[PDB]
Ligand SMILES: *[C@@H]1O[C@H](CO)[C@@H](O[C@@H]2O[C@H](CO)[C@@H](O[C@@H]3O[C@H](CO[C@H]4O[C@H](CO)[C@@H](O)[C@H](O)[C@@H]4O)[C@@H](O)[C@H](O[C@H]4O[C@H](CO)[C@@H](O)[C@H](O)[C@@H]4O[C@H]4O[C@H](CO)[C@@H](O)[C@H](O)[C@@H]4O[C@H]4O[C@H](CO)[C@@H](O)[C@H](O)[C@@H]4O)[C@@H]3O)[C@H](O)[C@H]2NC(C)=O)[C@H](O)[C@H]1NC(C)=O
Ligand SMILES: *[C@@H]1O[C@H](CO)[C@@H](O[C@@H]2O[C@H](CO)[C@@H](O[C@@H]3O[C@H](CO)[C@@H](O)[C@H](O[C@H]4O[C@H](CO)[C@@H](O)[C@H](O)[C@@H]4O)[C@@H]3O)[C@H](O)[C@H]2NC(C)=O)[C@H](O)[C@H]1NC(C)=O
Ligand SMILES: *[C@@H]1O[C@H](CO)[C@@H](O[C@@H]2O[C@H](CO)[C@@H](O[C@@H]3O[C@H](CO[C@H]4O[C@H](CO)[C@@H](O)[C@H](O)[C@@H]4O)[C@@H](O)[C@H](O)[C@@H]3O)[C@H](O)[C@H]2NC(C)=O)[C@H](O)[C@H]1NC(C)=O
Ligand SMILES: *[C@@H]1O[C@H](CO)[C@@H](O[C@@H]2O[C@H](CO)[C@@H](O[C@@H]3O[C@H](CO)[C@@H](O)[C@H](O)[C@@H]3O)[C@H](O)[C@H]2NC(C)=O)[C@H](O)[C@H]1NC(C)=O
């Protein structure tokens with residue numbers, strides 16, 4: 001006939017926003033716990049009546065490695081560690097704008113070091129006034145692939161700010177099957193995030209019994225235990241998924257390939273105790289469709305350290321000596337960070353060494369379901385009307 | 390009404406024709422008329438700032454459509470002819486298929502150009518109206 | 526203004542003619558321009574949710590009157606002839622006697638039928654306008 | 662937009678012509694789209710009551726302009742001739758010089774008289790429209 005342009009208003013159209021999100025955690029405001037002190041001064045109470053509006057037949061390209069929301073959580077946690085664990089000596093680099101002998105002299109800071117309590121708390125990132133947060137609901141989701149069961153919410157689920165390497169601690173589990181996520185496979189640079197569907201437990205202690213400070217002119221020793229009869233089940237499903245990506249090659253796990261002590265070993269915290277657990281008797285086994293472990297209590301030898309390398313930028317640190325005794329960590333294991341060793345020398349093998357260290361990758365495994373979008377209401381479409389003039 | 394305060398013309402996922410036709414059914418119906426905690430206060434305000442901002446944005450854009458002669462109307466109509474180099478599609482398949490999210494990516498290249506054509510057409514209607522004021 | 530946020534056309538109890546004539550007097554006047562407790566917060570919100578909901582309902586029905594061609598107007602006017610089997614009363618006694626609460630019960634039987642006639646008349650005006658678009 | 666919620670036509674201090682021309686630039690841009698404490702609650706409400714009252718006053722006066730036939734329009738236009746005993750100034754110097762605060766004191770004597778002329782002109786347009794209803 002005769003097409004004509006018209007303008008509508010209130011049209012459902014989405015975009016991508018780059019806003020700030022206020023946190024919302026269930027605090028206490030009375031104890032001397034660090035996270036309860038931080039959550040009281042900058043967080044609001046949790047929403048008692050949440051509403052999840054399920055959308056219809058919609059599809060959204062949920063990219064996860066280009067998510068700007070995870071770039072905010074990482075900057076909201078660094079501001080917590082500067083209020084929690086004050087280092088005794090904070091040695092950090094500082095260069096001068098001189099082209100090239102560049103003047104790069106260190107700048108140390110001496111602060112008081114009180115041994116404070118330490119325990120994470122689940123926080124909820126909520127959308128500000130005027131924006132909305134989308135959420136996929138597919139049981140696989142694939143990572144940067146578009147899903148179909150998109151539903152909108154206003155606040156995310158419980159997210160714990162646990163900082164660890166090689167094994168993602170406390171958090172959410174998978175829905176029905178162990179899925180693997182990676183930005184791009186076969187390029188051996190991007191870390192492969194593996195989410196488990198069953199909580200693998202871990203207990204780490206040192207009661208007292210080792211007040212022996214030095215040896216010659218132990219308090220620096222601890223251990224962990226993993227249920228071998230339960231851990232083999234979850235590992236048996238990981239190799240079942242990895243072989244689906246490489247059917248002719250051989251899955252061969254291995255220890256780390258070296259580097260900094262916070263990467264070669266596991267590293268988590270419990271009341272200022274910076275456990276550096278040697279994980280070689282957990283990834284030494286080579287694999288095929290059958291096992292190569294043995295046949296309960298895998299003694300994961302750990303060690304408290306004092307001079308660490310900060311994860312919140314370059315630069316060493318030095319904390320106060322450890323507590324006298326009774327340090328317990330009744331944790332869980334929900335994820336697993338694995339790298340890959342490919343190449344032209346790869347003679348039908350698959351090496352999956354433990355990686356991690358980039359804390360942004362620690363939270364991308366948690367903030368993969370969400371995305372912050374805004375509502376643009378204009379719209380233009382052709383029609384058959386005509387303005388009478 | 391379309392899962393948010395804004396975007397009330399219809400719910401996403403449905404096609405443009407099926408959503409606009411369902412609005413009229415929702416129009417006749419809505420017009421004929423046929424435990425606690427002290428921290429509910431903070432969330433009582435966060436639920437209000439989203440409603441006041443959505444209303445305050447509504448009234449702003451409702452008045453900003455006066456640049457195109459579509460002031461105060463959610464569904465306007467202009468007199469600018471629709472090019473064929475923009476979409477090259479019939480009015481039947483655009484409204485029966487291609488929901489709003491799909492249609493936006495279809496004309497996202499020219500959605501900034503069409504805004505320039507609508508304003509020029511408004512000044513022409515205002516100037517042509519002014520010429521008749523010399524007579525009447 | 527009529528003891529509530531809605532119902533601002535006049536106060537109840539007064540007749541339809543006396544209320545509409547008193548509104549114009551209130552129109553010229555308003556246009557020419559001639560102890561505490563912490564629990565005042567909870568009631569500070571309850572007094573806001575009644576004002577935001579009354580505004581949000583106002584804008585919804587103000588735009589829903591586009592079905593009858595009375596969009597954005599609190600006092601519209603149509604072209605549907607008034608039947609005599611509905612009220613059978615003169616325009617003088619309807620406005621001088623019979624306040625709004627009494628008039629509603631007078632035509633409550635046909636108030637659902639008249640809504641059907643107003644929509645059919647709007648589509649006819651839109652279709653007849655479209656036929657003139659073939660010429661102009 | 663003009664440093665307050667109301668007074669959004671422009672910022673004070675700028676002349677009437679420079680403010681009205683700058684609004685159109687702000688119109689195309691906005692349309693194309695190209696620590697905490699518990700006592701933040703009390704100030705969270707005081708910032709809302711100023712926004713709800715400004716919107717509720719906006720909708721009231723927007724509908725009260727129906728007395729002059731300028732309902733729903735922020736920039737109307739009438740047909741009452743401008744006297745020379747009111748300002749006796751050309752349309753060029755009024756818009757290039759004399760900002761809004763200065764212009765208000767210029768016609769504050771007659772700003773109450775002009776309101777009487779606008780209402781009489783509206784009733785005349787309504788009565789003259791009613792006479793044509795006898796024919797059409
Ligand atoms: C993953 O998630 C899991 C949760 O599912 C996380 O597991 C949590 O880990 C926490 C730390 O690792 C752990 O917290 C500890 O709990 C101890 C037991 O709590 C219970 O008892 C207390 C007291 O009876 C109850 O109030 C409470 O409700 C519980 O029922 C606490 O006792 C611990 O506090 C002590 O340790 C911290 C360590 O820095 C000290 O800062 C703190 O001040 C306390 O220190 C005293 O005790 C130590 C023990 O040796 C002494 O050495 C020290 O000098 C202090 O001693 C004084 O006080 C004692 C009395 O307590 C007195 O006898 C002595 O003479 C001194 O006067 C600490 O709070 C959580 O329980 C644990 N949760 C679960 C469910 O297991 C896990 O960490 C997460 N993963 C990661 C990586 O975070
Ligand atoms: C887990 O990863 C580690 C990565 O370090 C890997 O351990 C090393 O693997 C390399 C690759 O085979 C080993 O290197 C060779 O090992 C043979 C066997 O002992 C040596 O004889 C070789 O030394 C001779 O050859 C060199 C040239 O090839 C000469 O330059 C040299 O002078 C010698 O003449 C060569 O070193 C390496 O020994 C191991 N190291 C250890 C500690 O294991 C490990 O194999 C991976 N795990 C699994 C299960 O694959
Ligand atoms: C996801 O990651 C994958 C790996 O992590 C990416 O795969 C890459 O894909 C490209 C496209 O084929 C490969 O590039 C090839 O490289 C060879 C070797 O180059 C050498 O020889 C050429 C001449 O032959 C010479 O000019 C060069 O200088 C080199 O000396 C080329 O011969 C091919 O023509 C082709 O360009 C990459 O090798 C491959 N990466 C790896 C690690 O194998 C993949 O692209 C990623 N996905 C997306 C969507 O980007
Ligand atoms: C698409 O996404 C929606 C998101 O809500 C999914 O709906 C949810 O489905 C689960 C089942 O896996 C429901 O959990 C069940 O809830 C009922 C009632 O609360 C309870 O009886 C069960 O024990 C179980 O907990 C969940 O409630 C439901 N969401 C809502 C808001 O009701 C839906 O399943 C997804 N579609 C597919 C095909 O997965």
Ligand SMILES: *[C@@H]1O[C@H](CO)[C@@H](O[C@@H]2O[C@H](CO)[C@@H](O[C@@H]3O[C@H](CO)[C@@H](O)[C@H](O)[C@@H]3O)[C@H](O)[C@H]2NC(C)=O)[C@H](O)[C@H]1NC(C)=O
Nearest residue numbers: 255256261264265266276277278279280281284301302303
């Ligand atoms: C984590 O624990 C494992 C426990 O096996 C440690 O592996 C063992 O480390 C020692 C120290 O280097 C190795 O001994 C060396 O063996 C070579 C022969 O390859 C010999 O030439 C050296 O003189 C030295 O005796 C030992 O072989 C190695 N165990 C195995 C099975 O290879 C590992 O070092 C610990 N890692 C961390 C970071 O704590």
Ligand SMILES: *[C@@H]1O[C@H](CO)[C@@H](O[C@@H]2O[C@H](CO)[C@@H](O[C@@H]3O[C@H](CO)[C@@H](O)[C@H](O)[C@@H]3O)[C@H](O)[C@H]2NC(C)=O)[C@H](O)[C@H]1NC(C)=O
Nearest residue numbers: 228280281282283284285286292293294295296297298299
């Ligand atoms: C990779 O690491 C695992 C860590 O569990 C190794 O499994 C461990 O293998 C040793 C072999 O010497 C087992 O010791 C055995 O103890 C029994 C009872 O005392 C004794 O009768 C045997 O003669 C032997 O000494 C140890 O129990 C077992 N760990 C667990 C938790 O059962 C595995 O061997 C490592 N593989 C390689 C290739 O390094």
Ligand SMILES: *[C@@H]1O[C@H](CO)[C@@H](O[C@@H]2O[C@H](CO)[C@@H](O[C@@H]3O[C@H](CO)[C@@H](O)[C@H](O)[C@@H]3O)[C@H](O)[C@H]2NC(C)=O)[C@H](O)[C@H]1NC(C)=O
Nearest residue numbers: 201202203204205223224225226227228296297298299330
């Ligand atoms: C493998 O590791 C687990 C934990 O790492 C060991 O479980 C622990 O076993 C001891 C010995 O029975 C338990 O102590 C007992 O607890 C009961 C209950 O309170 C108490 O009444 C007894 O007097 C005694 O103290 C200990 O509680 C238990 N750990 C937990 C968390 O329950 C297990 O024994 C290890 N396997 C082997 C073969 O050693």
Ligand SMILES: *[C@@H]1O[C@H](CO)[C@@H](O[C@@H]2O[C@H](CO)[C@@H](O)[C@H](O)[C@H]2NC(C)=O)[C@H](O)[C@H]1NC(C)=O
Nearest residue numbers: 140141142143144145146147181182183184185
């Ligand atoms: C799962 O994710 C991968 C990428 O992470 C998607 O793979 C690409 O999909 C497009 C179209 O589906 C293809 O054109 C590309 O060739 C694929 N690339 C690779 C490397 O596989 C994949 O589509 C996602 N799965 C689903 C169901 O969407």
Ligand SMILES: *[C@@H]1O[C@H](CO)[C@@H](O[C@@H]2O[C@H](CO)[C@@H](O)[C@H](O)[C@H]2NC(C)=O)[C@H](O)[C@H]1NC(C)=O
Nearest residue numbers: 201202203204224225226227228296297330331
């Ligand atoms: C780690 O410790 C937890 C408790 O701190 C253990 O969980 C208990 O396991 C026993 C079985 O041995 C059950 O009877 C208890 O009911 C469990 N506790 C709870 C609260 O349910 C866990 O088994 C330990 N795991 C390892 C590998 O040491």
Ligand SMILES: *[C@@H]1O[C@H](CO)[C@@H](O[C@@H]2O[C@H](CO)[C@@H](O)[C@H](O)[C@H]2NC(C)=O)[C@H](O)[C@H]1NC(C)=O
Nearest residue numbers: 203204205206223224225226296297298299300
């Ligand atoms: C962690 O695992 C070690 C190794 O099995 C446990 O040490 C054993 O403890 C049981 C009972 O306490 C003893 O009968 C064994 O003789 C111990 N083994 C050795 C080699 O000494 C240790 O108890 C576990 N941790 C916890 C908290 O139970």
Ligand SMILES: *[C@@H]1O[C@H](CO)[C@@H](O[C@@H]2O[C@H](CO)[C@@H](O)[C@H](O)[C@H]2NC(C)=O)[C@H](O)[C@H]1NC(C)=O
Nearest residue numbers: 160169170171172198199200201330331332333
């Ligand atoms: C660590 O794992 C244990 C189970 O191994 C979790 O305990 C479960 O917690 C949920 C939460 O409501 C309960 O519904 C289950 O009944 C618990 N099961 C058992 C066996 O105790 C525990 O919550 C996990 N820890 C964290 C921090 O998630």
Ligand SMILES: *[C@@H]1O[C@H](CO)[C@@H](O)[C@H](O)[C@H]1NC(C)=O
Nearest residue numbers: 055056057400401402403404
């Ligand atoms: C989504 O598609 C199904 C397929 O039959 C349809 O029944 C349903 O109505 C669609 N959703 C909406 C909101 O129209």
Ligand SMILES: *[C@@H]1O[C@H](CO)[C@@H](O)[C@H](O)[C@H]1NC(C)=O
Nearest residue numbers: 227228229230232233236291
């Ligand atoms: C894993 O270990 C358990 C005992 O802890 C055993 O029952 C199970 O068979 C093992 N898995 C495999 C694949 O052998």
Ligand SMILES: *[C@@H]1O[C@H](CO)[C@@H](O)[C@H](O)[C@H]1NC(C)=O
Nearest residue numbers: 249250251287288289290348
């Ligand atoms: C791995 O297992 C397959 C059978 O599932 C077997 O054919 C193959 O030889 C095994 N690999 C090695 C290195 O023995």
Ligand SMILES: *[C@@H]1O[C@H](CO)[C@@H](O)[C@H](O)[C@H]1NC(C)=O
Nearest residue numbers: 470471472473474475499502
């Ligand atoms: C749109 O149609 C006009 C016809 O007047 C034509 O001149 C113009 O080039 C068309 N626009 C484009 C982008 O092709």
Ligand SMILES: *[C@@H]1O[C@H](CO)[C@@H](O)[C@H](O)[C@H]1NC(C)=O
Nearest residue numbers: 479481482483484485486487
């Ligand atoms: C919608 O698109 C399909 C092509 O995928 C086409 O076959 C169908 O005819 C279209 N619908 C209508 C009503 O024409």
Ligand SMILES: *[C@@H]1O[C@H](CO)[C@@H](O)[C@H](O)[C@H]1NC(C)=O
Nearest residue numbers: 493494495496497498499500
């Ligand atoms: C239109 O925009 C798309 C992105 O949505 C881009 O890929 C394409 O090249 C653009 N086309 C033109 C003609 O600008």
Ligand SMILES: *[C@@H]1O[C@H](CO)[C@@H](O)[C@H](O)[C@H]1NC(C)=O
Nearest residue numbers: 606607608609610611635638
């Ligand atoms: C209303 O008047 C019309 C005349 O056009 C008449 O046909 C109709 O029956 C009347 N309605 C009723 C309910 O009597």
Ligand SMILES: *[C@@H]1O[C@H](CO)[C@@H](O)[C@H](O)[C@H]1NC(C)=O
Nearest residue numbers: 615617618619620621622623
């Ligand atoms: C109002 O009704 C009464 C009957 O109760 C009647 O007498 C009177 O005339 C009516 N008012 C007018 C102005 O006609």
Ligand SMILES: *[C@@H]1O[C@H](CO)[C@@H](O)[C@H](O)[C@H]1NC(C)=O
Nearest residue numbers: 610630631632633634635636
């Ligand atoms: C009108 O409604 C009233 C009550 O709602 C009822 O008593 C009366 O009989 C009805 N009249 C007709 C004609 O339907």
